[PDB]
Amino acid sequence: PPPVGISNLPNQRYKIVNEEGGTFTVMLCGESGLGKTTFINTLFQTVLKRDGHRQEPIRKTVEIDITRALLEEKHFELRVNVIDTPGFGDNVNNNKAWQPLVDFIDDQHDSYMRQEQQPYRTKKFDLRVHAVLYFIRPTGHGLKPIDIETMKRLSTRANLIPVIAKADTLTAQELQQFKSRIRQVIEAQEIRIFTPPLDANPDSAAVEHARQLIEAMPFAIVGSEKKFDNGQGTQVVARKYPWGLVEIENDSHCDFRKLRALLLRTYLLDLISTTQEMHYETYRRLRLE
Amino acid sequence: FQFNIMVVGQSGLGKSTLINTLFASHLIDSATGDDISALPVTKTTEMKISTHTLVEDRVRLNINVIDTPGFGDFIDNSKAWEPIVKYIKEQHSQYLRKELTAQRERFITDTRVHAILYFLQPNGKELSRLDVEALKRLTEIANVIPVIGKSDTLTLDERTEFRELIQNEFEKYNFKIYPYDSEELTDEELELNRSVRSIIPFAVVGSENEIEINRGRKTRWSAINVEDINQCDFVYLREFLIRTHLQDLIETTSYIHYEGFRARQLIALKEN
Amino acid sequence: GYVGFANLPKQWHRRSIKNGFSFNLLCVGPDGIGKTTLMKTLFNNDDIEANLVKEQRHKVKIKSYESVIEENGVKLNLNVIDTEGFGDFLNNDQKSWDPIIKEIDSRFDQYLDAENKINRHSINDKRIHACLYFIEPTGHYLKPLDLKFMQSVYEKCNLIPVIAKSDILTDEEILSFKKTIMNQLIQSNIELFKPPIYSNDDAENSHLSERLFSSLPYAVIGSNDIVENYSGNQVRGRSYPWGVIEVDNDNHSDFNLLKNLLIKQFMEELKERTSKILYENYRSSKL
Amino acid sequence: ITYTMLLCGPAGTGKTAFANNLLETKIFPHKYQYGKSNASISSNPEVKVIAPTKVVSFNSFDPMRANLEPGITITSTSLELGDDTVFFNLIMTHGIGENLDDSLCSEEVMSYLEQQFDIVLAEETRIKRNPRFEDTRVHVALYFIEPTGHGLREVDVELMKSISKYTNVLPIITRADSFTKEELTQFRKNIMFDVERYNVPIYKFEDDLESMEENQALASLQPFAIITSDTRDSEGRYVREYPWGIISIDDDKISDLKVLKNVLFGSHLQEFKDTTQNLLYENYRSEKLSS
Ligand SMILES: Nc1nc2c(ncn2[C@@H]2O[C@H](COP(=O)(O)OP(=O)(O)O)[C@@H](O)[C@H]2O)c(=O)[nH]1
Ligand SMILES: Nc1nc2c(ncn2[C@@H]2O[C@H](COP(=O)(O)OP(=O)(O)O)[C@@H](O)[C@H]2O)c(=O)[nH]1
Ligand SMILES: Nc1nc2c(ncn2[C@@H]2O[C@H](COP(=O)(O)OP(=O)(O)O)[C@@H](O)[C@H]2O)c(=O)[nH]1
Ligand SMILES: Nc1nc2c(ncn2[C@@H]2O[C@H](COP(=O)(O)OP(=O)(O)O)[C@@H](O)[C@H]2O)c(=O)[nH]1
């Protein structure tokens, strides 16, 4: 009694996926001094970005800068598209500062739609942002009007992943209270934020990690490009202050590893698929009304 | 004596090899070849007649192997039995022309179709449009002895069921397959006819090449003996068309088909 | 450390197994060539053609059958098309075999239409991902009608020509018939699907792909029933009064190679080619 | 003496905690966790609540109304911390940095300072003047620099200039624990470079050899970086607590807060008062009299 190769179809799919290559697009929104450049330099283990762009006119115009790179880890290549928001929230008047970013996301969606409008369409330049990380200054107080309205405006264009910048600045109780206030605000304002798919699972631990990830939002981010010894003979990436060392790789000090699980390790494919099946589809429908 | 045996089928069915093996010499080479360009130039079934002399049984016989290249070998076979019918009836008209001729000869060569071997493909399905029409118009114009090509393509039970299906198809279409039971025949003759009739359509396997083990085709998983009775009906068909009924075949082609065409043609001439 | 962006292919594997798979296969040949036995032996399901989905005849009939075949958890939704009447007609003109082409074009048309809808709601792919042409084991040459149809279909669907009932032909006969068929195909410009060889892949898997390409036209046999081997071992195949042929034996048939090129190894690649090259050409024509 | 100090900065700097630490009394509540006590009786023997917290200016947790812009709100809380008896009225700004346009905030703060100047002028130019009238002029002002680590923003510069027009303005780096040693050094250097570039008239720590040396050192210290907490250790030491370590506000290296407190309420208090009262106010009065 011989078998059919139905069980080998997924391994074929894996082969084509790994031999083709991937593309990830992340928009890092926030003000100046939220540890964003350092975060993206820490999440990819490489220096994708810089030193700050600085010493220029104080009135910054909100612009969009895309830093593109090709990264190879295990013979798999990823085109990382780190989009920035220079000058956003860094001015005395920040009204209509959300317009450029949502407009850029809509422009990428329209570009993909027009690539589909091609008569003999070929390989696709997909710059639609698969994730949007909005960084909140660790005020420990609440979300600002600029913050909430920008987040709500861009929550329909693509996936939104709230994060509390420089979360090590806040003490444990203060950061937890800040997280609670942020969650209540985004629940009342009805802002839409990406949630890992746990359904309602064969790998009950995977959907359990989904639950753990969704119970850790807004994520606490602690990023450093320098490593220090822990005192036990192991060098951990960390932020070194004389009172104590804030290790980025310890789950007890930060939620950075959860964010890496959501963004690149575990729920990267899900983010890409949601950005391409939910957001882009709505934009295309409205554009073609 | 002069015997005329015709083979009707498509390229592959194994008719040239069957004739080659039933006579023990290379008489007919495949008229279709291995080129799609070797097919007829008239885009209709053509006739290839080759005369050989075989006297190995000390019964000297003048064989005339007829072949129908082009049958079921083009896309449009809507008239792939018309040329065969025309050939048969023209060969009959020659004999009647000599017999209706004044001061004719002693030996008016009999070029008529004494026997026909219509090769039925081993597909297991009912008769196709081409097969049905050709058997319909060739059963009453000449003596037809059904045979199944590449009977290696059907397991024993598959071959039996396909043979029963073809037998029922013959009965349904009212097709007249040789041998024909008559009243002159004796009892032994009637029972022999019943047996060969139950064998029809035959299931013959042919090979002009000999194999060594411990005549047939030897392959990787299989080894057939063309002269094995528990493997093929090649021996039965051989004996039937060479010895058992050869005389009856040549007599019925001169007594039933030819005299029928004679009556028809002469009646038509009388009317006009 | 190791940033885990090389783990995305594994997430794709998991997604694939979670969402199953779907394969639309076409089978064109004469009635009695063995396209109902080959399919069931390929999918090890004797009822592979029991889910029939929704003044004389002068055109082939296109029959659609949808089944589901699941192995080790993964599930595949198979939709097999069978031609009924090919060759049975004494006309066998372009109109005779046109319905098959029209059906393939209709699948592509439905896909294109749903892709070009304002709602653009979830669409199900019915496009024919492969076309198996069954070639009778005459042993002489590729026939006119065979050449005409295979040329008419070599652009619409991936072409997988096979030599049916190959157990009758001797080894040398099979080789010669295979060579003649391949020569006729190349000189009709009929093009067949070439298995892709992934990069950073095993050289043995590359050799398998090359052999799969260079073994065409294949010589496949079909018998889901079990027969006893001369070794006393029950094996899938056919038993005749002279010998026993085994469908799973590579020495006897290219059945395992066809199963590799059609289901086990390059089913997904066949679907990718059909949805990325053939369908886009159909779209350009419709444009 | 009657001393007046302003505390201005973007929301989330640590002004409330800084004031509580300075007073050693939790007299100012943190937003959203308030209403349990706002201007309660002092927990410090020296601190007295001579006037509860009250709003001096206005220009405009409820999750449904979180989007609404607060605007600006200036509040003066009067206390008596003790000849030594000092009548200290602390003015504070809230809603600055919590809206889209912060021009309203700068306008309101400048207008409050100008109105206090005008009140003092009117009292001076009165036929019957109250010799012991209570001046509302802001003798000193501290601007909190948000811990960006890069430099000064636009709102920062404009607000500091507006505050400098009517009172002495001191650049104070807040939440210095957010910066490591090198990071804090670079941030301070950037702040100084930006104020020099835009010519912000920030206060300068610029008769005795020891006095000159102290002024030089204090100038080199600016902007003053500080860690402040309104929470104390079980022993009674104002401290911050983190999972990786516990910070003490008293520690000299962690915070320059005690030098800042000394200059604000000790050494340079009279200097700030005299400069605001006899240089800024006098020039404003001269300009008004020329008008
Ligand atoms: N408290 C804290 N400060 C950080 C962290 N990462 C970086 N910084 C500080 O912020 C600077 C980097 O900011 P940068 O990433 O360039 O800014 P942004 O991209 O505009 O948000 C560093 O020089 C540090 O002074 C962090 O995890 N926590
Ligand atoms: N398996 C099998 N092959 C056969 C049989 N008879 C003939 N063949 C093969 O059929 C091929 C073509 O037969 P041939 O008589 O030359 O051709 P035709 O006159 O055009 O049908 C030859 O290569 C033979 O090997 C048979 O009984 N079984
Ligand atoms: N000689 C031979 N016969 C086969 C082979 N596979 C199937 N058959 C026979 O071919 C016949 C017709 O096959 P079937 O699947 O019913 O044909 P379809 O009408 O084309 O679907 C069946 O009765 C089988 O016994 C094979 O490999 N060799
Ligand atoms: N890391 C750090 N946090 C502080 C410091 N001072 C106060 N905080 C915290 O940061 C927030 C400051 O809010 P508050 O002082 O009311 O600010 P204001 O509204 O700008 O006056 C509170 O959550 C305090 O617990 C400090 O020096 N360092």
| CATH number of the domain encompassing residue C105 | 3.40.50.300
Q: Is C214 helix (H, G, I), strand (E, B) or coil?
A: helix
Task: Single out the residue of C215, C145, C142 nearest to residue C181, CA to CA.
Answer: C142
Residue from B8, B15, B16, B17 to probe ligand 2 pocket by mutation (most atoms less than 8 Å from CB): B17
Residue C165 Cα to ligand 3 midpoint, Å, equals 7
Q: Which residues of C touch B128 (CB under 8 A)?
A: 87-88, 90
How far is the C-alpha of C49 from the C-alpha of C54, rounded, in Å? 13
Task: Decide if D66 and A169 are in contact by the 8 Å CB cutoff.
Answer: no
Residues 170 through 189 of chain A touching chain C, CB cutoff 8 Å: none
Q: Which atom of ligand 4 is nearest to the CA of D9?
A: 20
End-to-end CA gap in chain B: 36
Are the C-beta atoms of residues B123 and C88 closer than 8 Å to each other? no
Min Cα distance B139 → chain C (Å) is 19
Residue B8, beta-bridge partner list: B118
DSSP B208: S
| Residue type at C159 in one-letter notation | L
Q: What is the dihedral of CA B75, B79, B84, B87, to 10 degrees?
A: -130
The SS3 call for residue B227 is: coil
Rg (alpha carbons) of chain D, rounded to whole number: 19
Structure tokens at A279: 């957001």
Answer yes or no: is the C-beta of A85 below 6 A from any ligand 1 atom.
Answer: no
Cα D252 from chain centroid? 21
Bridge partners of A246, per DSSP, are A239
Dihedral (CA of C39, C41, C44, C47) sign? positive
How far is the C-alpha of B202 from the C-alpha of B194, rounded, in Å?
14
Helix (H) / strand (E) element for B2: namely strand B2-8
DSSP code for C196: P
Is any ligand 2 atom within 6 A of the Cβ of residue B16?
Answer: yes
Nearest-by-Cβ selection for B36 from C141, C170, C176: C141
The C-alpha atoms of residue C232 and residue C235 are separated, in whole angstroms, by 9
Neighbours of C207 (CB within 10 A): 11
CA of C191 to the centre of ligand 2 (A): 29
Q: Can you read off the two tokens belonging to residue D254?
A: 């962690």
> Which of C88, C139, C246 is opposite residue B12, by nearest beta carbon?
C139
* Angle ∠(C39,C40,C43) on CA atoms, nearest 5: 85
Nearest to C97 by CA among C30, C51, C45: C30
User: Is the Cα dihedral B144, B145, B146, B149 positive or negative?
Assistant: negative
CATH of the domain at A24: 3.40.50.300
> Ligand 4, closest atom to CA D231?
25
Distance (Å, rounded) from C-alpha C141 to C-alpha A49?
66
Distance of alpha carbon C171 from alpha carbon C216, whole angstroms: 15
Can you give the residue range of the structural domain that contains B108?
2-271
3-state secondary structure of B3: strand
Token pair listed for D204: 């300068």
Question: What residues of chain D lie within 8 A of the CB of A58, using their CB?
Answer: 152-154, 157, 198
Domain D2-290 has CATH 3.40.50.2020: no
Question: How close C138 gets to chain B, by Cα (Å)?
Answer: 4
- Cis amide leading into B201 (omega within 30): yes
Q: Which of residues 38-67 of C touch A (CB under 8 A)?
A: 42-44
C267 and A5 within 8 Å at the Cβ level: the answer is: yes
Per-residue CA distances from B230 to B24, C240, C241 (Å): 21, 11, 8
Hey, which residues 222-261 in chain C have their CB within 8 Å of chain B?
Answer: 238-246, 249, 251-252
Question: Minimal CA–CA distance to C185: which of C211, C220, C149?
Answer: C149
B218 lines ligand 2 (CB under 6 A): no
**Closest residue to atom 14 of ligand 2, CA basis:** B14
Q: Which secondary structure element, helix H or strand E, spans residue B173, and what is its range?
A: helix B156-173
Tally of structural domains, chain B? 1
Contact assessment for residue D201 and residue D169, using Cβ atoms and an 8 Å cutoff: yes
As a three-state string, the secondary structure of chain A is: CCCCHHHHHHHHHHHHHHHHCEEEEEEEECCCCCCHHHHHHHHCCCCCCCCCCCCCCCCCCCCCEEEEEEEECCCCEEEEEEEECCCCCCCCECCCCCHHHHHHHHHHHHHHHHHHCCCCCCCCCCCCCCEEEEEECCCCCCCCHHHHHHHHHHCCCCCEEEEECCCCCCCHHHHHHHHHHHHHHHHHCCCCCCCCCCCCCCCHHHHHHHHHHHCCCCEECCCCCCEEECCCCCEEEEEECCCCEEECCCCCCCCHHHHHHHHHHCCHHHHHHHHHHHHHHHHHHHHCC
In this complex, the residue of A16, A268, A288 whose CB is nearest that of residue C272 is A16
With contact defined as beta carbons under 8 Å apart, do D254 and D223 qualify? no
3-state secondary structure (DSSP) of residue B140: coil
Whether C1 is covered by a domain: the verdict is no
Q: Which burial class, exposed, middle or buried, applies to B88 when counting CB atoms under 10 A from its CB (0-12, 13-18, 19+)?
A: buried
CATH number where B205 lies? 3.40.50.300
Give the number of domains in chain C: 1
Closest among D156, D141, D227 to D190, alpha carbons compared: D156
**Secondary structure (H, E, C), C135-190:** ECCCCCCCCHHHHHHHHHHCCCCCECCEECCCCCCCHHHHHHHHHHHHHHHHHCCC
Q: In what order do the strands lie in the sheet with B61-67?
A: B48-54, B61-67, B2-8, B115-120, B147-148, B202-203
The neighbour count for residue A197, using CB atoms within 10 Å, is 14
Cα separation of B204 and B237, whole Å?
Answer: 7
How close B156 gets to chain C, by Cα (Å)?
A: 7
A196 Cβ closer than 6 Å to some ligand 1 atom: no
- Tokens 């990325």 correspond to C276
Q: Which residues from chain C sit within 8 angstroms of residue B231, using beta carbons?
A: 241-242
Question: What are the distances in angstroms from CA D67 to CA A162, A189, D62?
Answer: 17, 8, 10
Q: Which domain holds residue C69?
A: 8-286
Contacts of D121 (CB under 8 A, 6+ apart): D281, D284, D285, D288
Q: What tokens does B49 get?
A: 């007649």
| Three-state DSSP state, B201 | coil
3-state secondary structure chain D: CEEEEEEECCCCCCHHHHHHHHHCCCCCCCCCCCCCCCCCCCCCCCCCCCEEEEEEEEECCCHHHCCCCCCEEEEEEEEEECCCCEEEEEEEEECCCCCCECHHHHHHHHHHHHHHHHHHHHHHCCCCCCCCCCCCCCCEEEEEECCCCCCCCHHHHHHHHHHHHHCEEEEEEECHHHCCHHHHHHHHHHHHHHHHHHCCCCCCCCCCHHHHHHHHHHHHHCCEEECCCCCECCCCCEEEECCCCEEECCCCCCCCHHHHHHHHHCCCHHHHHHHHHHHHHHHHHHHHHHC
Residues of A in contact with D180 (CB under 8 A): 239-241
* Within-domain flag for A215: yes
CB within 8 A of C160, min separation 6: which ones?
A: C130, C131, C132, C133, C192, C193, C216, C218, C258, C261, C262
Are the beta carbons of D245 and A243 separated by less than 8 Å? Answer: yes
Q: Domain span at residue A169?
A: 20-287
- Exposure b/e, D43-67, CB count within 10 A at least 16 = b: eeeebbbeeebeebbeeeeebeebb
Q: Under DSSP, is residue B94 helix (H, G, I), strand (E, B) or coil?
A: helix
Considering only CB atoms, which chain D residues are within 8 Å of A253? 243-244
The C-alpha R_g of chain B, in whole angstroms, comes to: 19
Query: How would you classify residue A45: left for phi > 0, otherwise alpha for psi between -120 and 50, otherwise beta?
Result: left
> How far is the centre of ligand 1, averaged over its atoms, from the C-alpha of A178 (Å)?
19
C84 is in an annotated binding site: no
β-bridge pairing A131-136 and A22-29: parallel
Which residues of B93-201 form beta strands (DSSP E)? 115-120, 147-148
Are A114 and A148 in contact, with CB atoms under 8 Å apart? no
Torsion angle defined by CA atoms of residues B192, B198, B201 and B207, in that order, rounded to the nearest 10 degrees: -60
Q: How far apart are CA B3 and CA B143, in angstroms?
A: 13
Determine contact, residues B225/B53, Cβ cutoff 8 Å. Answer: no
- Quote the ligand 1 centre to D119 CA distance (angstroms): 45
The two tokens of residue A281 are 């589809």
* Strand ranges for B96-144 from DSSP E: 115-120
CB contact under 8 A, C31 and B125: yes
Q: Which amino acid belongs to residue B28? A: I
C-alpha distances (whole Å) from A8 to each of A141, C23, C74, C130, C260 are 53, 14, 8, 18, 10
Q: Is C36 annotated as a binding residue?
A: yes
* Residue in chain C nearest B12 by alpha carbon: C138
CA dihedral C153, C155, C157, C162 (to 10 degrees): 60
Task: Show the tokens assigned to C128.
Answer: 């024919």
- What chains are in contact with D, requiring at least 3 Cβ pairs below 8 Å? A
C-alpha span between D77 and C123 (Å, rounded): 68
Helix C94-115 to helix C144-153 angle (10° resolution) is 10
Q: Does A5 fall in a domain?
A: no
Confirm or reject: Cβ of C139 under 6 Å from ligand 2: yes
DSSP state of B240: I
Q: Is C10 annotated as a binding residue?
A: no
Cβ–Cβ gap C9/A76 under 8 Å = yes
User: Domains of chain D: which residue ranges?
Assistant: 2-290
**How many C-beta atoms lie closer than 10 Å to residue D37's C-beta?**
11
Residue D5: beta bridge partners?
D90, D140
Contact B223, B207 (CB under 8 A): no
Residue owning tokens 């050449």: C147
Rounded to an integer, what distance in angstroms lies between the CA atom of residue D102 and that of residue D146? Answer: 15
DSSP B229: T
Beta-ladder partners of C239:
C244
Q: How far is A121 from chain D (nearest CA, A)?
A: 44
Amino acid identity for residue A55 in this structure: Q
Residues D42 and D23: beta-carbon distance below 8 Å: yes
- Which ligand has the nearest atom to the CA of A176? 4
Vertex C132 angle, CA C128 and C133, to 5°: 125
- State the Cα–Cα distance between residues A199 and A284, nearest whole angstrom: 27
What is the number of the ligand closest to the CA of B204? Answer: 2
Cα dihedral: D113, D114, D116, D117 (round 10): 120
Please report whether residue A11 resides in a domain: no
Nearest partner of C191 among C156, C164, C144, judged by Cα: C156
How far does C239 lie from chain B, in Å, by closest CA? 7
Q: Is A138 on the interface with D (CB under 8 A)?
A: yes
Asked if C116 and C142 count as a contact pair (C-beta separation under 8 A), the reply is: no
C32 is in an annotated binding site: yes
Q: Choosing among C82, C90, C151, which should be mutated to test the B contact, i.e. which has the most B CBs within 10 A?
A: C90
Total domains in chain A come to: 1
Q: Could you tell me whether strands A227-229 and C234-239 are parallel, antiparallel, or unpaired per DSSP bridges?
A: unpaired
Pairing of strands D2-8, D86-94: parallel
Those residues whose C-beta lies under 8 Å from the C-beta of residue B196, and which sit 6 or more positions away, are B179, B236, B240, B244, B245
| Interface contact D241-A93, CB threshold 8 A | no
The DSSP bridge partners found for residue D76 are D54, D91
Residue A3 counted as domain residue: no
Cβ atoms of residues A129 and A83 within 8 Å: yes
Residues of chain B with a CB closer than 8 angstroms to some CB in chain C? 10-13, 30, 32-36, 39, 73-78, 80, 121, 123-125, 128-130, 133, 150, 152-153, 155-156, 217-224, 230-231
Q: Alpha-carbon distance C83 to C99, whole Å?
A: 9
Q: Please indicate whether, in this complex, the C-beta atoms of C148 and B75 are within 8 angstroms of each other.
A: yes
Per DSSP bridges, beta strands D239-241 and D86-94 are: unpaired
Ligand 2 mean position, distance from CA B15 (Å)? 7
Task: Give the C-alpha separation, B74 to B10, whole Å.
Answer: 10
The vertex-C202 CA angle with C190 and C211, nearest 5°, equals 30
Resolution of the PDB structure in angstroms? 3.2
Which amino acid is residue B150, in one-letter code?
K
DSSP state of B153: G
Residue with CA closest to ligand 2 atom 13: B14
Residue B96: CB atoms within 10 Å: 17
Q: How many CA atoms lie within 13 A of C274 on its CB side?
A: 31
User: What is the rounded CA–CA span in Å between residue C100 and residue C152?
Assistant: 10
* Residue minimizing CA distance to atom 21 of ligand 3: C36
Residue recorded with tokens 């070797």: B38
Tell me the C-alpha to C-alpha distance, in Å, between residue A80 and each of A44, A77, A128, A222, D232: 9, 9, 12, 21, 47
Whole-angstrom distance, CA of residue D101 vs CA of residue D69: 10
C91: Cα separation from own chain's centroid: 26
For C179, the token pair is 């060579």
D175: number of CA atoms within 13 Å, CB side?
Answer: 24
| Cβ contact, residue pair A142, D97, below 8 Å | no
Cβ neighbours of D211 (radius 10 Å): 10
